[PDB]
Amino acid sequence: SGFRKMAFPSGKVEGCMVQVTCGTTTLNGLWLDDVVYCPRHVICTSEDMLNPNYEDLLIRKSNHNFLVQAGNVQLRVIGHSMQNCVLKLKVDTANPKTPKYKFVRIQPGQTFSVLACYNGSPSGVYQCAMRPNFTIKGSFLNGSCGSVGFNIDYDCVSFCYMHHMELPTGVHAGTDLEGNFYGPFVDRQTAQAAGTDTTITVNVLAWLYAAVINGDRWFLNRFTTTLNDFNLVAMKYNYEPLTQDHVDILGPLSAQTGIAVLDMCASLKELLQNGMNGRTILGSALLEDEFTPFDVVRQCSGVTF
Amino acid sequence: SGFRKMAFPSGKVEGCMVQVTCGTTTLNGLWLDDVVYCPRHVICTSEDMLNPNYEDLLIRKSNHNFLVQAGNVQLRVIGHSMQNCVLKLKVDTANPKTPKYKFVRIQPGQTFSVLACYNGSPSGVYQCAMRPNFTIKGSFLNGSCGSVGFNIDYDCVSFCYMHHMELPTGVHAGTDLEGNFYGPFVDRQTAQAAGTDTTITVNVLAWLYAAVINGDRWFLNRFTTTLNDFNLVAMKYNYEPLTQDHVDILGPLSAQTGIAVLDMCASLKELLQNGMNGRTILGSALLEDEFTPFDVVRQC
Ligand SMILES: O=C(Cc1ccc(Cl)cn1)Nc1cncc2ccccc12
Ligand SMILES: O=C(Cc1ccc(Cl)cn1)Nc1cncc2ccccc12
């Protein structure tokens, strides 16, 4: 019993965190094989950030301008290239702690663990979801740029996020490991705002199933709904549309608890229109949307790595 | 910006998780140097759970009765001893991944990260607080026994908890790494119930300071309170008494935000009276009590 916002064990990722310095800027890098990946804005000055030409800024740099530190060992940079918004620093030493890994781009609603780092040193691990507006509600301070988001599938670390910036609302923006930003964001010091956020409906339903598995049933009702009537309700309360794909993904949880997905949707519909009425679900007075259906199955079944 | 329930990076602890088997029972062990620590109930049978005589059950065991597996490598048990409710299995190999570590016993209200494990394999990491009733609200299934709670402060891993059991309410009970249980619990299947749980007041105040640091001030008021009047009100909402020690501990946050502890106490009194009225504090519709004053300063 119990249900916590649980992150993947971060060990395989901690072995990859290095410190990258370029002039006065110091941030984090991900050392995989003989390449260190970090945000390309590491080559910028505060003036350069206002309107940067990264090809022009990078062409002026030499390998010795990038100081890479893996623990208390300096790694020598033997090459440097840019792929979208990520700088790739070729180093002389392959990371002996390189795990089995992939670079994956995730979709909004998908969750991942963030290993927050400062000066190439991991300081904390938390779980979060890629919001439908492509931001993440992280916890990041100055120097966290280069911190990575990941999932662990069996023995393979799927790197899905690299932290680049904080938006004025306190939410965070970053790229996949190929340097492609999530969302309509650019790595420039300018006016950028995240779009209006929505609730990840499939994730709320997954979390309602987790509450049922944990003995919290007060919100269940005798009712069911059509997928179209539920989506008309979801659209009204800034909830993401629930697709037939989502209904299929919730199938195992529906079979385990004996509550059909559209029956759980009628519970969610009632919760949206009436509220919790002084009650809580899994110790929460809000509907939690940062647990995917896979996270719920994984946690309520003990999958190890 | 942002405020998350953040756990410590678990790598230093993952390198210590091993699987311990005794007969039919399989649980987790913590391999530090040449010793594997695990709950002593690993030696118990089916009818030896209500009133186990651990000294009697352990005297009947030999080293070869304990199978210890570190990854895909079997470790050879060369000794076994019991220290309170923890079994210490001396092995023939020192763990090369042993970090700098300490065994620390924590007080209620303290937080720690839990590395949940099954069959010596880490499956997830989450942040917990030791409840005032000495239980933890963890997320654990069968086979999680032996999973550990820890903090990492300046490269050193302070192990503070080893999971032993789940109480009938779904909350968890365990020991420090010296085998001393937290709370009035025993490692027997006898009827055991946690005392009524209360809110960790100092932690709620720390979290209100975190919200102020993050730009949220809607809940602040023009009132102050005496510590005694605060405690008389807070006690009625099942909040822990706030001691002068707690007021002192909140001093740095009070100085950083410019809000005196007793002024913040008056906001808390008002929040308990009014609720949130549709508002949230740091994305939460409830008052969060699993962030200590130290966690707030560290994260902000
Ligand atoms: O935002 C930047 C630096 C930066 C990078 C790119 C651009 Cl376009 C503009 N600024 N770093 C930070 C990242 N995350 C949280 C942060 C909290 C506080 C301060 C700095 C934080
Ligand atoms: O509580 C026990 C078994 C046990 C150990 C020691 C003593 Cl004295 C009595 N019973 N194990 C478990 C631990 N944590 C979560 C659990 C969820 C579900 C099932 C079993 C769980």
XYZ file of C-alpha atoms and ligand atoms in Angstrom:
647
model
C 0.000 0.000 0.000
C 0.828 3.651 -0.472
C 1.171 5.827 -3.534
C 3.998 8.257 -3.928
C 5.314 10.416 -6.754
C 8.195 8.152 -7.443
C 11.132 8.762 -9.684
C 13.294 6.113 -11.423
C 16.500 5.197 -9.505
C 18.968 7.899 -10.712
C 22.275 5.976 -10.380
C 22.715 5.213 -14.100
C 22.289 8.958 -14.839
C 24.457 10.245 -11.927
C 27.431 8.396 -13.479
C 27.003 10.650 -16.588
C 26.788 14.112 -14.995
C 29.728 16.395 -15.713
C 30.376 20.153 -15.321
C 30.799 22.223 -18.498
C 32.407 25.652 -18.396
C 32.761 28.161 -21.217
C 34.215 31.477 -20.095
C 32.083 32.660 -17.171
C 29.134 30.263 -17.817
C 29.102 26.981 -15.912
C 26.322 24.392 -16.365
C 25.774 20.604 -16.555
C 26.637 18.159 -19.293
C 25.629 14.580 -19.978
C 28.701 12.413 -20.709
C 27.723 9.378 -22.780
C 30.470 7.354 -24.530
C 33.050 9.988 -25.773
C 30.513 12.848 -26.140
C 29.327 15.437 -23.601
C 25.925 16.972 -24.377
C 24.965 20.342 -22.883
C 22.721 23.387 -23.806
C 24.314 25.395 -26.633
C 23.663 28.644 -24.667
C 26.803 27.736 -22.576
C 28.806 29.667 -25.258
C 26.807 32.895 -24.660
C 27.437 36.119 -22.706
C 24.386 37.959 -21.184
C 24.536 40.270 -24.287
C 24.944 37.267 -26.654
C 21.780 35.682 -25.144
C 19.658 38.716 -26.208
C 20.038 37.876 -29.932
C 22.458 34.962 -30.451
C 24.022 33.627 -33.633
C 25.172 30.273 -32.349
C 27.044 29.308 -35.547
C 29.003 32.615 -35.270
C 29.607 32.210 -31.511
C 30.670 28.568 -31.872
C 33.024 29.162 -34.829
C 35.055 31.516 -32.552
C 35.524 28.742 -29.945
C 38.281 26.179 -29.796
C 38.258 22.869 -27.865
C 40.381 24.349 -25.041
C 37.698 27.048 -24.436
C 35.403 24.304 -23.018
C 36.463 23.038 -19.580
C 34.729 19.700 -18.869
C 34.995 18.299 -15.357
C 33.938 14.724 -14.504
C 34.135 14.715 -10.701
C 37.624 15.983 -9.875
C 39.034 14.942 -13.300
C 39.308 17.341 -16.225
C 38.213 15.714 -19.534
C 40.005 17.052 -22.612
C 37.722 18.296 -25.384
C 38.903 17.016 -28.811
C 35.911 18.274 -30.885
C 32.781 20.444 -30.731
C 29.639 20.507 -32.829
C 26.062 21.721 -32.556
C 22.894 19.755 -33.149
C 19.867 22.052 -32.858
C 20.009 23.605 -29.323
C 22.514 21.084 -27.915
C 26.259 21.413 -27.994
C 28.135 18.117 -28.408
C 31.652 18.159 -26.974
C 33.738 15.271 -28.227
C 36.089 14.198 -25.401
C 39.197 11.942 -25.397
C 37.768 9.518 -22.806
C 34.670 7.367 -23.207
C 32.607 7.421 -19.969
C 33.195 4.037 -18.335
C 29.900 4.482 -16.454
C 27.884 4.852 -19.714
C 24.705 2.824 -19.308
C 22.621 1.209 -22.086
C 20.807 4.333 -23.400
C 18.555 5.840 -26.076
C 17.511 9.366 -26.936
C 13.719 9.543 -27.014
C 11.412 12.453 -27.615
C 8.370 12.283 -25.343
C 4.796 13.444 -25.895
C 2.882 15.833 -23.533
C 1.401 13.855 -20.644
C 4.340 11.460 -20.531
C 6.284 11.525 -17.262
C 9.999 11.322 -16.530
C 12.458 11.667 -13.661
C 14.617 14.779 -13.423
C 18.058 14.599 -11.897
C 18.629 18.242 -10.902
C 22.371 19.079 -11.022
C 24.556 22.053 -10.188
C 28.231 22.131 -11.192
C 28.040 18.586 -12.614
C 26.881 17.290 -9.206
C 23.432 15.693 -8.751
C 21.488 17.285 -5.912
C 17.996 15.821 -6.210
C 15.668 13.586 -8.159
C 12.013 14.287 -8.818
C 9.246 13.100 -11.084
C 7.269 15.295 -13.380
C 5.216 15.329 -16.517
C 5.656 17.108 -19.819
C 2.664 19.481 -19.578
C 0.274 19.722 -22.601
C 1.726 23.278 -23.077
C 5.217 21.625 -23.318
C 6.608 23.110 -20.137
C 7.594 21.161 -17.052
C 6.736 22.349 -13.535
C 10.230 21.630 -12.238
C 12.279 22.846 -9.343
C 15.353 24.540 -10.756
C 17.778 27.281 -9.676
C 20.665 29.082 -11.491
C 23.175 26.456 -12.683
C 20.570 23.717 -13.236
C 20.790 24.131 -17.101
C 21.946 20.807 -18.549
C 20.073 18.710 -15.904
C 18.311 15.779 -17.584
C 14.953 14.058 -17.643
C 14.831 10.317 -18.235
C 12.935 7.059 -17.931
C 14.447 3.650 -17.250
C 13.006 0.849 -19.363
C 14.434 -2.517 -18.131
C 18.233 -1.737 -18.181
C 18.020 1.102 -20.818
C 18.044 4.776 -19.825
C 15.853 6.748 -22.259
C 17.018 10.345 -22.054
C 14.121 12.571 -22.987
C 14.848 16.027 -21.597
C 17.623 18.509 -21.087
C 16.876 21.611 -19.065
C 17.594 24.928 -20.793
C 15.578 27.740 -19.190
C 13.017 29.075 -16.760
C 10.037 30.989 -18.107
C 8.710 34.127 -16.264
C 5.897 32.097 -14.666
C 8.450 29.859 -12.885
C 7.826 26.878 -15.214
C 10.666 25.285 -17.197
C 11.510 24.734 -20.820
C 14.035 22.429 -22.436
C 14.853 20.145 -25.351
C 15.038 16.425 -26.150
C 18.685 15.113 -26.323
C 18.788 15.923 -30.052
C 18.413 19.650 -29.097
C 14.827 20.061 -30.298
C 12.837 22.149 -27.859
C 9.607 20.923 -26.365
C 7.107 23.694 -27.090
C 7.204 27.001 -28.914
C 10.317 28.130 -27.114
C 13.705 29.470 -28.275
C 17.027 29.640 -26.387
C 17.166 33.412 -26.337
C 16.692 36.042 -23.589
C 13.342 37.443 -24.864
C 9.567 37.609 -24.073
C 8.328 34.002 -24.072
C 5.177 32.691 -22.454
C 3.764 29.206 -22.157
C 0.322 28.619 -23.593
C -2.656 27.982 -21.288
C -2.098 24.669 -19.562
C -4.559 21.796 -19.541
C -5.035 18.702 -17.340
C -3.703 15.393 -18.616
C -7.010 13.469 -18.520
C -5.606 9.949 -19.075
C -3.177 10.553 -16.192
C -5.978 11.689 -13.834
C -7.934 8.532 -14.713
C -4.794 6.400 -14.103
C -4.399 8.097 -10.690
C -8.090 7.480 -9.862
C -7.402 3.761 -10.627
C -4.384 3.892 -8.292
C -6.658 5.322 -5.552
C -9.138 2.462 -6.104
C -6.276 -0.086 -5.923
C -5.293 1.594 -2.621
C -8.826 1.329 -1.127
C -10.078 4.925 -1.852
C -13.563 4.343 -3.553
C -15.770 7.207 -2.323
C -15.741 8.896 -5.777
C -16.998 5.819 -7.643
C -20.575 5.895 -8.837
C -23.058 3.646 -10.637
C -22.759 5.810 -13.764
C -21.075 5.591 -17.126
C -20.644 8.050 -20.018
C -19.984 8.040 -23.740
C -16.430 9.027 -24.745
C -17.909 11.973 -26.714
C -20.002 13.289 -23.760
C -16.978 12.998 -21.474
C -14.810 14.947 -23.994
C -17.470 17.672 -24.189
C -17.127 17.901 -20.334
C -13.282 17.640 -20.420
C -13.069 20.513 -22.954
C -15.183 22.697 -20.620
C -12.864 22.151 -17.608
C -9.541 22.592 -19.542
C -8.932 18.868 -19.640
C -7.137 17.277 -22.543
C -9.339 15.211 -24.927
C -9.391 11.514 -23.970
C -8.770 9.425 -27.087
C -9.700 5.783 -27.788
C -5.910 5.152 -27.443
C -6.107 6.408 -23.817
C -9.132 4.168 -23.161
C -7.122 1.181 -24.494
C -4.054 2.107 -22.406
C -6.284 2.169 -19.255
C -7.613 -1.342 -20.092
C -5.364 -3.322 -17.699
C -6.239 -0.997 -14.751
C -9.938 -1.210 -15.716
C -9.720 -5.047 -15.662
C -7.746 -5.132 -12.363
C -10.189 -2.838 -10.497
C -13.361 -3.969 -12.326
C -14.227 -0.356 -13.182
C -14.676 0.312 -16.945
C -12.779 3.363 -18.292
C -16.045 5.150 -19.192
C -17.402 4.268 -15.689
C -14.243 5.946 -14.191
C -14.860 8.891 -16.628
C -18.330 9.381 -15.064
C -16.546 9.594 -11.631
C -14.151 12.198 -13.104
C -17.058 14.091 -14.714
C -18.854 14.256 -11.342
C -15.578 15.350 -9.621
C -15.157 18.178 -12.161
C -18.741 19.463 -11.837
C -19.161 18.985 -8.057
C -15.667 18.841 -6.588
C -14.358 16.563 -3.834
C -16.633 18.120 -1.145
C -14.061 18.286 1.695
C -12.740 14.832 0.807
C -9.339 13.732 -0.521
C -8.085 11.017 -2.918
C -4.675 9.514 -2.031
C -4.066 12.412 0.401
C -4.802 15.002 -2.265
C -7.556 17.639 -2.526
C -6.663 18.131 -6.252
C -6.914 15.683 -9.156
C -3.343 14.470 -9.784
C -2.262 14.284 -13.456
C 1.464 13.411 -13.198
C 1.117 9.597 -13.075
C 0.695 7.873 -16.442
C -1.216 4.577 -16.678
C 2.199 2.868 -16.943
C 3.490 4.611 -13.794
C 0.408 3.351 -11.886
C 0.866 -0.260 -13.083
C 4.637 -0.075 -12.403
C 4.133 1.259 -8.829
C 1.182 -0.962 -7.906
C 3.154 -4.061 -9.200
C 6.820 -3.385 -8.150
C 8.770 -3.343 -11.448
C 12.564 -3.161 -10.707
C 15.683 -1.731 -12.557
C 11.719 28.773 -9.129
C 9.397 25.868 -8.427
C 8.958 23.632 -5.420
C 8.888 19.896 -5.743
C 8.971 16.984 -3.339
C 12.492 16.095 -4.223
C 14.344 12.937 -3.235
C 18.145 12.624 -2.961
C 19.878 11.031 -5.987
C 19.745 7.288 -5.178
C 22.922 6.064 -6.942
C 25.046 5.741 -3.797
C 22.312 3.574 -2.235
C 21.543 1.487 -5.389
C 25.139 0.234 -5.330
C 24.396 -1.271 -1.858
C 21.140 -3.133 -2.540
C 21.387 -6.910 -2.373
C 18.840 -9.749 -2.167
C 18.753 -11.815 1.046
C 17.119 -15.231 1.131
C 16.515 -17.485 4.134
C 14.499 -20.585 3.276
C 11.336 -19.377 1.535
C 11.657 -15.686 2.616
C 13.346 -13.283 0.209
C 13.829 -9.566 1.011
C 16.374 -6.727 0.586
C 19.672 -6.155 2.328
C 22.005 -3.184 2.538
C 25.594 -4.185 1.715
C 28.055 -1.770 3.315
C 31.755 -2.767 3.557
C 31.731 -6.558 4.392
C 28.331 -6.509 6.202
C 24.805 -6.963 4.812
C 22.046 -5.494 6.994
C 18.465 -6.751 6.635
C 15.279 -7.130 8.841
C 15.735 -10.005 11.295
C 12.236 -11.341 10.374
C 13.916 -12.865 7.229
C 14.609 -15.960 9.454
C 10.875 -16.377 10.401
C 8.562 -19.166 9.191
C 4.670 -19.188 8.823
C 3.694 -20.050 12.455
C 6.832 -18.273 13.788
C 5.497 -14.751 13.102
C 3.059 -14.001 15.958
C 5.581 -14.671 18.768
C 8.985 -15.349 17.156
C 11.904 -15.960 19.525
C 14.537 -14.490 17.250
C 17.501 -15.576 19.420
C 16.163 -19.177 19.310
C 15.442 -19.006 15.519
C 18.886 -17.449 14.761
C 20.861 -19.939 16.894
C 19.449 -22.716 14.606
C 20.847 -20.994 11.477
C 24.245 -21.404 9.885
C 25.961 -19.037 7.386
C 25.019 -21.281 4.425
C 21.295 -20.901 5.313
C 21.510 -17.218 4.144
C 21.778 -16.768 0.361
C 22.964 -13.207 -0.447
C 22.827 -12.062 -4.069
C 24.550 -8.851 -5.236
C 23.325 -8.479 -8.809
C 24.043 -11.813 -10.484
C 26.841 -12.687 -7.997
C 26.285 -14.818 -4.896
C 28.109 -13.363 -1.840
C 29.413 -15.868 0.721
C 28.098 -15.403 4.267
C 30.989 -15.880 6.749
C 29.149 -14.676 9.912
C 25.727 -13.690 11.275
C 24.674 -11.648 14.266
C 21.614 -9.788 15.464
C 21.524 -6.241 16.681
C 18.007 -5.417 17.915
C 15.639 -6.034 14.915
C 18.369 -6.070 12.262
C 20.283 -9.097 11.128
C 23.925 -8.414 10.204
C 25.369 -10.900 7.716
C 29.143 -10.772 7.549
C 30.189 -11.510 3.938
C 33.574 -12.445 2.367
C 33.618 -9.448 -0.028
C 33.609 -5.773 0.928
C 31.192 -3.839 -1.331
C 33.399 -1.891 -3.747
C 30.518 0.558 -4.261
C 30.351 1.403 -0.493
C 29.895 5.148 -0.212
C 30.938 7.393 2.715
C 28.104 6.574 5.172
C 26.684 6.979 8.690
C 23.818 5.426 10.604
C 21.576 8.166 11.989
C 18.372 7.822 14.025
C 15.893 10.518 12.994
C 13.172 12.324 14.955
C 9.475 12.619 13.836
C 9.067 15.359 11.261
C 12.431 14.572 9.630
C 12.369 13.734 5.967
C 14.317 11.171 3.975
C 14.381 9.494 0.557
C 13.232 5.913 0.210
C 14.749 3.613 -2.373
C 12.008 0.991 -2.766
C 13.533 -2.411 -3.704
C 12.252 -5.869 -4.563
C 14.628 -8.839 -4.842
C 17.670 -6.627 -4.223
C 16.689 -4.452 -7.237
C 15.771 -0.761 -6.888
C 12.450 0.088 -8.491
C 11.814 3.673 -7.411
C 12.795 6.588 -5.239
C 10.460 8.843 -3.257
C 10.587 11.374 -0.434
C 8.999 10.563 3.006
C 8.703 12.144 6.444
C 8.828 10.194 9.709
C 5.266 10.906 10.927
C 4.749 12.176 14.525
C 3.195 8.718 15.227
C 6.533 7.146 14.025
C 5.114 5.534 10.920
C 5.960 6.480 7.333
C 3.376 6.850 4.569
C 5.393 4.901 2.037
C 4.562 3.033 -1.109
C 5.583 -0.538 -0.515
C 4.442 -3.962 -1.645
C 5.368 -7.516 -0.513
C 9.147 -7.996 -0.896
C 9.958 -4.351 -0.091
C 11.228 -5.320 3.426
C 14.819 -4.196 3.733
C 14.336 -1.089 1.488
C 16.084 1.909 3.070
C 15.470 5.540 3.892
C 18.391 7.954 3.689
C 19.641 11.516 3.313
C 22.765 12.607 1.455
C 24.531 15.534 3.010
C 27.906 16.614 1.606
C 28.818 13.330 -0.235
C 27.882 11.161 2.796
C 24.877 8.816 2.913
C 23.094 8.929 6.273
C 21.000 5.776 6.490
C 18.081 6.419 8.807
C 15.446 3.829 8.010
C 15.024 0.202 7.095
C 11.545 -0.946 6.136
C 10.223 -3.874 8.153
C 6.431 -3.991 7.870
C 3.112 -2.580 6.802
C 0.521 -1.797 9.498
C -3.219 -2.571 8.883
C -3.897 1.053 7.888
C -1.438 0.789 4.960
C 1.239 2.886 6.713
C 4.742 1.548 7.303
C 6.926 0.769 10.255
C 10.636 0.140 10.389
C 13.847 0.626 12.315
C 16.976 2.784 12.231
C 20.066 0.881 10.874
C 20.905 -0.248 14.439
C 17.619 -2.257 14.443
C 15.732 0.000 16.868
C 12.177 0.467 15.734
C 10.686 3.891 15.273
C 7.516 3.935 17.370
C 5.825 1.428 19.655
C 6.119 -1.330 17.104
C 7.512 -4.789 17.229
C 8.450 -7.227 14.461
C 5.578 -9.670 15.307
C 2.252 -10.254 13.475
C 0.415 -9.210 16.724
C -2.343 -6.538 16.600
C -0.468 -3.245 16.241
C -1.915 0.148 15.570
C -0.257 3.475 15.019
C -1.259 6.304 17.315
C -3.458 9.107 15.864
C -1.398 10.928 13.258
C -0.825 14.671 13.458
C 0.452 17.381 11.099
C 4.116 18.369 11.419
C 3.527 22.048 12.214
C 7.150 23.206 11.828
C 7.225 21.607 8.361
C 3.976 23.366 7.296
C 5.470 26.686 8.450
C 8.710 25.912 6.539
C 6.614 25.165 3.432
C 4.636 28.467 3.888
C 8.058 30.230 3.945
C 8.974 28.344 0.707
C 5.776 29.714 -0.876
C 6.661 33.267 0.220
C 10.205 32.818 -1.203
C 8.549 31.661 -4.458
C 6.392 34.858 -4.647
C 3.192 33.663 -2.993
C 1.795 35.868 -0.305
C -2.009 35.632 -0.558
C -2.266 33.731 2.777
C -0.284 36.264 4.828
C -2.225 38.457 7.322
C -1.642 41.512 9.520
C -1.809 39.355 12.664
C 0.714 37.877 14.984
C 0.091 35.342 17.766
C 1.618 34.180 21.008
C 3.236 30.720 20.740
C 0.759 29.453 23.381
C -2.360 30.797 21.583
C -1.026 29.259 18.320
C -0.614 25.877 20.006
C -4.117 26.036 21.530
C -5.626 26.595 18.044
C -3.264 24.266 16.059
C -3.871 21.383 18.526
C -7.586 21.528 17.613
C -6.714 20.734 13.958
C -4.494 17.776 15.020
C -1.333 19.801 14.458
C 1.786 18.982 16.491
C 2.684 21.494 19.223
C 5.193 24.054 17.894
C 8.063 24.307 20.366
C 10.516 27.169 20.945
C 13.082 24.834 19.216
C 10.884 24.930 16.065
C 10.616 28.741 16.276
C 14.444 28.909 16.462
C 14.846 26.485 13.533
C 12.543 28.731 11.415
C 14.703 31.806 12.227
C 16.770 31.832 8.984
C 13.590 31.581 6.816
C 11.946 34.297 8.954
C 14.993 36.575 8.358
C 15.155 35.781 4.607
C 11.443 36.541 3.994
C 11.079 39.275 6.649
C 8.073 37.459 8.169
C 8.455 36.679 11.922
C 7.703 33.049 12.928
C 4.745 34.122 15.095
C 3.402 36.240 12.148
C 3.634 33.139 9.919
C 1.914 31.226 12.781
C -1.024 33.654 12.498
C -1.259 32.942 8.695
C -1.285 29.199 9.467
C -4.035 29.753 12.082
C -6.070 31.605 9.472
C -5.512 28.941 6.779
C -6.759 26.270 9.210
C -9.825 28.426 9.900
C -10.651 29.434 6.302
C -9.217 26.712 4.138
C -7.826 27.774 0.743
C -11.045 29.069 -0.895
C -10.130 27.629 -4.293
C -6.523 28.850 -4.079
C -3.336 26.778 -3.968
C -0.019 27.262 -2.217
C 2.863 25.970 -4.356
C 0.419 24.003 -6.540
C -1.189 22.346 -3.529
C -4.748 22.610 -2.166
C -3.581 21.105 1.189
C -0.984 22.314 3.711
C 2.178 20.279 3.004
C 4.063 18.898 5.991
C 6.789 16.733 4.388
C 9.382 19.509 3.842
C 11.544 20.411 6.801
C 13.013 23.908 7.373
C 16.365 22.400 6.148
C 14.716 21.007 2.948
C 13.215 24.456 2.184
C 16.540 26.293 2.550
C 18.302 23.553 0.527
C 15.773 23.602 -2.327
C 15.373 27.386 -2.473
O 17.130 30.660 -17.242
C 18.304 30.359 -17.020
C 19.443 30.927 -17.843
C 18.981 31.220 -19.250
C 19.165 30.298 -20.276
C 18.590 30.556 -21.505
C 17.868 31.714 -21.669
Cl 17.094 32.037 -23.193
C 17.747 32.602 -20.616
N 18.299 32.366 -19.419
N 18.689 29.503 -16.046
C 17.872 28.861 -15.101
C 17.259 27.627 -15.314
N 16.323 27.090 -14.522
C 15.961 27.776 -13.445
C 16.510 29.029 -13.077
C 16.114 29.741 -11.919
C 16.687 30.943 -11.612
C 17.668 31.488 -12.432
C 18.071 30.839 -13.563
C 17.505 29.588 -13.926
O 4.367 -6.351 6.286
C 4.948 -7.178 5.579
C 5.160 -8.607 6.030
C 5.572 -8.667 7.478
C 6.877 -8.393 7.865
C 7.194 -8.453 9.208
C 6.213 -8.790 10.106
Cl 6.630 -9.021 11.779
C 4.925 -9.026 9.658
N 4.603 -8.973 8.358
N 5.414 -6.915 4.340
C 5.179 -5.769 3.569
C 5.917 -4.591 3.680
N 5.580 -3.424 3.115
C 4.461 -3.388 2.402
C 3.618 -4.505 2.182
C 2.438 -4.450 1.399
C 1.688 -5.574 1.193
C 2.069 -6.789 1.744
C 3.193 -6.882 2.514
C 4.001 -5.744 2.766
